[PDB]
Amino acid sequence: QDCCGERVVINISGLRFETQLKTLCQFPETLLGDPKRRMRYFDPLRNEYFFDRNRPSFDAILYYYQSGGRIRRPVNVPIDIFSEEIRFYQLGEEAMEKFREDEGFL
Amino acid sequence: QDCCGERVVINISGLRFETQLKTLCQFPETLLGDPKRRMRYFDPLRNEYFFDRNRPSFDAILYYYQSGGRIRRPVNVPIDIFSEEIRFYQLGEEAMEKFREDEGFL
Amino acid sequence: QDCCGERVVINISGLRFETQLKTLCQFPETLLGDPKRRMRYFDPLRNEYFFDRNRPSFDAILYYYQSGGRIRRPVNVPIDIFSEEIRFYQLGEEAMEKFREDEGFL
Amino acid sequence: QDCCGERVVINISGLRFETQLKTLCQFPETLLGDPKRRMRYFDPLRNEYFFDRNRPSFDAILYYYQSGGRIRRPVNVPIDIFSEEIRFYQLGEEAMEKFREDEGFL
Amino acid sequence: RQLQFYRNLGKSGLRVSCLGLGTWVTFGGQITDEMAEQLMTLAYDNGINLFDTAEVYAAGKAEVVLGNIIKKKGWRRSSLVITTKIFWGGKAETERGLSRKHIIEGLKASLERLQLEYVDVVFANRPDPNTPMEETVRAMTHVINQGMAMYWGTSRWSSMEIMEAYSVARQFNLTPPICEQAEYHMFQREKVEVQLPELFHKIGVGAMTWSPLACGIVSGKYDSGIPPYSRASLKGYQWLKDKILSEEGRRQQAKLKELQAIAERLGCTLPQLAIAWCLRNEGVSSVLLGASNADQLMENIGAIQVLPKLSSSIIHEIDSILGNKPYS
Amino acid sequence: RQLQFYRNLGKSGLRVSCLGLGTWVTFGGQITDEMAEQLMTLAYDNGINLFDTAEVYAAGKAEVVLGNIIKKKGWRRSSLVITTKIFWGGKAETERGLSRKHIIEGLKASLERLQLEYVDVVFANRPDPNTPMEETVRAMTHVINQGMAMYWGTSRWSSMEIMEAYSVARQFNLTPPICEQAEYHMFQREKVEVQLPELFHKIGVGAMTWSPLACGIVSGKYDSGIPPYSRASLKGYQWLKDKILSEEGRRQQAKLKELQAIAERLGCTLPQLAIAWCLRNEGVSSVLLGASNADQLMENIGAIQVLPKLSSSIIHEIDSILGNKPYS
Amino acid sequence: RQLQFYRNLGKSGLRVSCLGLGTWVTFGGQITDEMAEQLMTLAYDNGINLFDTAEVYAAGKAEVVLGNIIKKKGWRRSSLVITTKIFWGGKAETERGLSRKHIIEGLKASLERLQLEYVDVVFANRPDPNTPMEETVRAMTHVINQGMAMYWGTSRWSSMEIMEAYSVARQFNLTPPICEQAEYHMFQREKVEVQLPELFHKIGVGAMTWSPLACGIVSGKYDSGIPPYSRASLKGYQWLKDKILSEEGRRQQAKLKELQAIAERLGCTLPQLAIAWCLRNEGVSSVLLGASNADQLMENIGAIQVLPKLSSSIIHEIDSILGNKPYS
Amino acid sequence: RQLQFYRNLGKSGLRVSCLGLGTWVTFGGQITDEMAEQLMTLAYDNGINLFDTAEVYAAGKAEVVLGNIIKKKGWRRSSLVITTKIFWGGKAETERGLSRKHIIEGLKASLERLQLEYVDVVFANRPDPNTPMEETVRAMTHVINQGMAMYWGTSRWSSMEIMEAYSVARQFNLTPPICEQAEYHMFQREKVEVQLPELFHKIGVGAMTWSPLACGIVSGKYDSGIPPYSRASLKGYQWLKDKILSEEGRRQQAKLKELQAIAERLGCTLPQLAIAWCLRNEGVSSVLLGASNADQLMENIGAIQVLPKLSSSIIHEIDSILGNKPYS
Ligand SMILES: NC(=O)c1ccc[n+]([C@@H]2O[C@H](COP(=O)([O-])OP(=O)(O)OC[C@H]3O[C@@H](n4cnc5c(N)ncnc54)[C@H](OP(=O)(O)O)[C@@H]3O)[C@@H](O)[C@H]2O)c1
Ligand SMILES: NC(=O)c1ccc[n+]([C@@H]2O[C@H](COP(=O)([O-])OP(=O)(O)OC[C@H]3O[C@@H](n4cnc5c(N)ncnc54)[C@H](OP(=O)(O)O)[C@@H]3O)[C@@H](O)[C@H]2O)c1
Ligand SMILES: NC(=O)c1ccc[n+]([C@@H]2O[C@H](COP(=O)([O-])OP(=O)(O)OC[C@H]3O[C@@H](n4cnc5c(N)ncnc54)[C@H](OP(=O)(O)O)[C@@H]3O)[C@@H](O)[C@H]2O)c1
Numbered sequence A, B, C, D: 001q002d003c004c005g006e007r008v009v010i011n012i013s014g015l016r017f018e019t020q021l022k023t024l025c026q027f028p029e030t031l032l033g034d035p036k037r038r039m040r041y042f043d044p045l046r047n048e049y050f051f052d053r054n055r056p057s058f059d060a061i062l063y064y065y066q067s068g069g070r071i072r073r074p075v076n077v078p079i080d081i082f083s084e085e086i087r088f089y090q091l092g093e094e095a096m097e098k099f100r101e102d103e104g105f106l
Numbered sequence E, F, G, H: 001r002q003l004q005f006y007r008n009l010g011k012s013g014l015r016v017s018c019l020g021l022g023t024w025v026t027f028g029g030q031i032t033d034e035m036a037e038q039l040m041t042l043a044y045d046n047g048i049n050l051f052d053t054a055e056v057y058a059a060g061k062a063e064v065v066l067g068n069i070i071k072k073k074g075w076r077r078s079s080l081v082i083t084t085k086i087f088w089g090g091k092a093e094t095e096r097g098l099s100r101k102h103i104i105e106g107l108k109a110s111l112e113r114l115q116l117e118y119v120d121v122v123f124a125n126r127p128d129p130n131t132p133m134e135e136t137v138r139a140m141t142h143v144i145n146q147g148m149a150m151y152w153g154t155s156r157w158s159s160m161e162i163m164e165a166y167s168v169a170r171q172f173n174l175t176p177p178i179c180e181q182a183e184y185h186m187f188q189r190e191k192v193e194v195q196l197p198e199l200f201h202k203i204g205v206g207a208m209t210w211s212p213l214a215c216g217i218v219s220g221k222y223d224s225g226i227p228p229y230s231r232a233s234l235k236g237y238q239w240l241k242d243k244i245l246s247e248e249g250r251r252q253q254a255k256l257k258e259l260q261a262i263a264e265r266l267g268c269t270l271p272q273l274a275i276a277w278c279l280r281n282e283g284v285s286s287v288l289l290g291a292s293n294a295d296q297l298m299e300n301i302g303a304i305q306v307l308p309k310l311s312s313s314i315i316h317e318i319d320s321i322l323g324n325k326p327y328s
């Protein structure tokens, strides 16, 4: 559980993101923070994780990890698409609560 | 018609998109869903399909396939450019009807 | 002056654009449409043209060639930066007139 | 201190930017303009500098160097994130003063 | 327009005649060495430059006699195209498959038996489920870069496996294959006609068909029964005899009598029409033949004269008599 | 289901038996050359094709006698799998490590002593902190591309070093390793059971375990004391004798008596149960054995009959007696 | 400033003299071996290090005599630049073109005839429409990496084909060409002056021109008629005689008389002015000469003294007399 | 802590002693072969494994005598590190520079003179403005991949050229250099101290310094005048004598007298202090020595005892006396 120094490449429909492993293992209860859940998306020929999903949401998903827990919806993406992305990436219940608090109506 | 597991790279003026073949073959009546129509855009030296077309529209075109049929115009792109892109990629008549219903005036 | 079939890669500060040569040679009076003017930006080790310039303007610059002559400023870019880009890429005087007509005040 | 002709690749979480060295050495008092400060971010296996930081701010950070000193916040990025990026990249105090003058309230 | 009329093998720069000679059951087995030398001299004097063998044929004796004839007659190496196939090499566990070890050792043993320095094309004889595709493509690229071969191709693969080999080669900057050997005659029409033209138009992989006479069935000699000194009367070939003597063989013999009437109307023999029917489309580059004596080879070469006489009406009449055209 | 039952080494196309013979203390040292030839003939006649040696074992005399037996008996090279390990090569400073110079020179000297042209797998015997990983992967790719080896693997590396070697190979378009040699018996269970299956499921790296009987401890011969002509009575092995005679060895002997009661209930001997216990999971590809005479090897081969008798209740009873199962 | 004044061949590191000696009609044909040895000794003693031949010239006899002279005189290999050209190799179908098989076999046969280990530059003699460009660039990169050549170039290609070869080489990380051989004299001015400087400024491909005297027309010997023992009087050269005797040749002879008046005013001969006119720009690296006897070669070497006397007024006067300057 | 104390050459896996022996003016020139054998035996018996030569030193006679001594004494090749330098190879135009042709031919001629199969490091002796960097890096990668060398480095290059070579190697997936040879003594301090540590911390390029005694100036023998049988009294060395006899040499002799007083206080000789001063920082990997007889070499080896006695106060006192410390 050191998570030290190794770099991880995440491919979202051809758009590539890079980070360190200690950034991802700050939240071990999520899909990307747990090694047992993300192992079915590994591509051995290219050394990356591949997701066939929506592209403008993963900048906010990665900034949730890089800022220590801040949820901020992009202006282009609607409510239901971003809610489905939060439900897929398994960020928890307090991330949904912060999303509903930041979005007003909740 | 299995369309199983093989990955397809689509190059739109230097911007690269990746998906699976079973995502594209859900709609066999379109340009990308039919093997006879998209075969004239294949590049054998690079193993990709190349289109010399408009770049910010193909995110919405790919999300039409990935969401099961939802049409949503990007905020930056005007009406006539996106209508010409829908006419080129041969999404049908019900996609045009959903576009006119979502855009108001229709 | 055939300009047939050969592909051209243009690199704008690390962001890569691809097109065909017959798209560029529709306007032979510009910087990219004339072989004598663009030859000082060629990189022989990488087979591309390199410009150390502003990145969100070249989508509109490329769509000027791909749409047959339509000028449309991006929403993010201000007036003076886009005017300097039009002056650098040598699109002419009627492109400036269409820009001033589309922008209102002219 | 010639800084002549050599190209520099900067990688911001998988998004790649290229520039010349004489563009960066116009401001020797910053992080990227000084060789002693940026040397701890060099990657020798890939010949680039890597930062695990926020992606939509570095277009404005690079345009600060390319335009000779103009600060312009992107429309998507909030105030505090862009202020933290200006504080990290060590642009000085007059860049903060121009940011507060352009943003109104200062 | 088949033999001494040359065309590219796929989309590569290698040019072959459209008739070749095969080194199956005859060479080292059924016929003698002098008859084999007579057949090779008769094939070479008519412009055929393509000869095909394998390491499993009579445990290497076909390769031994093929290397003896070339060294005896003194032909130049630059005027010949020699191919070999590698899957089965011995009784041990490590002497079969498509791993790196067996590909290198089998090609070295085949080149030692043939008394040659290199072959032109090396084929994988059948697909291997126990090996990754990347190891196979890297081993084929290795033996091409060492100078032991010039090209490589596949045999009895499906379209998904050929496309996977192409995509692995494009991913890791390796060498893609150029050819595929498939079975094609008048009663086996599916794969060559419905699956291979898509691969030829997409990635430029040609076809080199084998068994044009269905081991002698379409030649029309088994109508009365089983004649002596045929392939069905040999030991170890009970399956062909059971295929001929069954109830499907009688319907095949009746259709062969009608096709013999058509070929007699055209002015030729039934094996010439059956060989020239396989070359009527541009997706087939070459046809590999087999022959037991010199009269059979001199008759089989004569399909060149009957190839330009195949109009669309005769092809429609043949498809009406046969009745097994696949649906696109 | 171990010897003369073949399986892939990792996810590669190389197929090995699951029992091999090792060239440690016996060969060139403890036993004579005629006994070594008798052991190799007895192993080869039962279907074992895997033989493993190193350049440090008796300063190359094990490689010399192993190359003498193969050349005397006239076996085919394509039916054997030979491995070597390279870290220690001499007394000078430049004759140890994992640099390019020592890898090339050590593999050339080992191939000259073995009288061979190539080996099948070449192992790095231990990790090197003084060399970059890129130099090691480039030197291994170089000796594979020159034809001196077919595959390469690691030994006594951790998971981070194996993953770093894989990522360097994928970055620079080089060749990744295929295997790892780890120690595994009934009193050493941690690494093979908790760290290696993640690597096998992720990047396809198999395991080839060594010392299944803990240098003779689990065989049950040291209960009374130290018998003559054993490994503990040899010169230079005081550490094994001090391990046996200590207070932990008495508890190990009591647990070995209970396991001997279980193995006597099952109908076999204790070394057969101890060898077949290592092969109960699919992550282990092969087990390397050691033997001093032919009776020990003929007893050790007989674990094939007791491998299918291991149900879940017997495994739970063995884990209850041992009491050292690692926590996942 | 041409011979014993050295310059780079294109933008590569190879330095050549700007006069070379060619191995066409004379060597192995028109002249004897002793005259060929005398010509090569006279060229080598004046500082010429560039010698050019081909595999089609007198069916290899030019390469045989060129390899005999070098081995007889004992010159060092590191002080010579030897080039060969490969398109035509025999009468068979597989012995011509630019495929992988013919490139490897033709270069091996040329090196065997020349008694050498390698050449310096290997040229493709003409373009091939039946082969893909990727196969040609991969075969040229293969023979460079095996040590049979150092560089490669093209001959009689257009600019689109050279740019396609460059882009394929940059795409697949292969080796681009360095040179192009084009025809250039006073009545053939289009390609070298209007198409090649763009390629030289863009991708750094130099030019090595051939036939500076138009097979002896610009030398001024055919004004009265056809003298005996000339190239036009030889068998197999009726086309040159029909070109000389036609109505265009009379206008060429009148313009040659005016140019002879200019060259007599300058203090030299007409072949010296015609050779030195080709080297007046920096885009041409070398000029290949031809000679039948030693007096012709000693006269042709003397253009070095008349090269610095070409001012802009004399060039404008020559362009006014000739009247065929291409428009940019 | 210099000789028989080993350290890595840069960040590579090659380990060298920090004293080496150089094959300049003495070998093949000033001294005999028996004295050269005595010097090499005395260096090898004390743990020095690094020996350095070049192809320009006495036209190859230094390489000839260095290859004779190694073959006579029977030392193992794996315990020695041999380096060569290549820029000047002959009188012709094509026998100098850093093109592909001269690199391959010069390394083959050097290996033929040395009677070896490979060298360890091959150096480029000076930069070449007439060759592109990509051709140089591709030729060095070619001779490493063919087995004629293990590593390569530069000599007398600037930092921009070394960084350009690194970036070209990273762009085209080639091999970067590992070392740089620079001049470094007490009166030449700029480059090693202000330019090379940035390259060592960034891309891991070490330094191997030469001339630690300024061809005998810092040794303190020229205070009275020019003694007989010195390097300044030899023919062809008037420049060193004019440097010694000028007005700067008197100030250098006065500073050498003060440094001799310091070294006599420390308990040693002035050449031992001058050699051990070059090794006080970690950016220098090795120092190459020169010696005319065995007493000089036995004195020069004794700097190992005076290396740990250099505290910061003595270094500050030496910098105060010298007065030429560069500013960072
Ligand atoms: N890729 C693969 O895996 C594969 C597999 C099998 C074969 N092949 C290739 O296929 C090639 C062709 O072999 P094939 O024998 O199957 O082709 P074939 O032409 O269909 O077989 C014809 C057989 O019938 C007989 N025959 C030939 N001409 C005749 C004629 N005018 N009249 C009467 N009988 C005639 C011959 O001997 P009989 O009279 O004694 O019958 C001959 O053996 C082989 O050489 C081999 O290289 C490849
Ligand atoms: N990767 C590495 O670094 C590494 C390190 C070490 C070894 N290895 C490999 O491991 C392989 C196995 O060597 P090993 O000797 O340690 O394995 P082992 O099977 O655990 O050792 C068994 C020892 O006990 C004795 N023995 C064997 N069967 C017996 C039986 N039925 N009854 C009583 N005694 C028996 C034998 O001689 P005695 O009776 O005289 O005791 C034998 O030496 C070696 O060949 C080597 O290749 C690899
Ligand atoms: N890249 C290609 O495909 C290609 C094709 C053709 C040639 N080349 C090269 O071009 C090179 C040059 O060959 P070339 O003969 O055509 O060049 P050339 O110099 O134009 O031919 C001159 C001819 O005229 C005669 N001559 C030479 N000097 C003379 C002088 N002072 N006075 C009177 N006559 C003189 C000579 O013999 P005569 O007096 O008997 O006429 C000579 O054969 C050849 O060696 C070949 O390597 C290349």
Ligand SMILES: NC(=O)c1ccc[n+]([C@@H]2O[C@H](COP(=O)([O-])OP(=O)(O)OC[C@H]3O[C@@H](n4cnc5c(N)ncnc54)[C@H](OP(=O)(O)O)[C@@H]3O)[C@@H](O)[C@H]2O)c1
Pocket (backbone or CB within 6 Å): H021, H022, H023, H024, H052, H053, H125, H155, H156, H181, H182, H210, H211, H212, H213, H214, H215, H216, H217, H219, H221, H229, H230, H231, H232, H271, H288, H289, H290, H291, H292, H296, H297, H299, H300
């Ligand atoms: N990279 C390059 O381009 C380059 C260029 C030049 C040299 N090098 C290398 O540098 C290495 C060192 O050569 P170097 O001679 O210049 O080094 P050096 O040690 O500075 O030269 C010392 C000279 O002074 C004399 N000497 C040595 N020890 C002495 C002592 N205790 N007392 C009095 N005199 C002593 C010796 O002969 P004398 O008494 O007769 O003077 C010796 O020739 C050479 O071997 C060569 O490989 C490299």
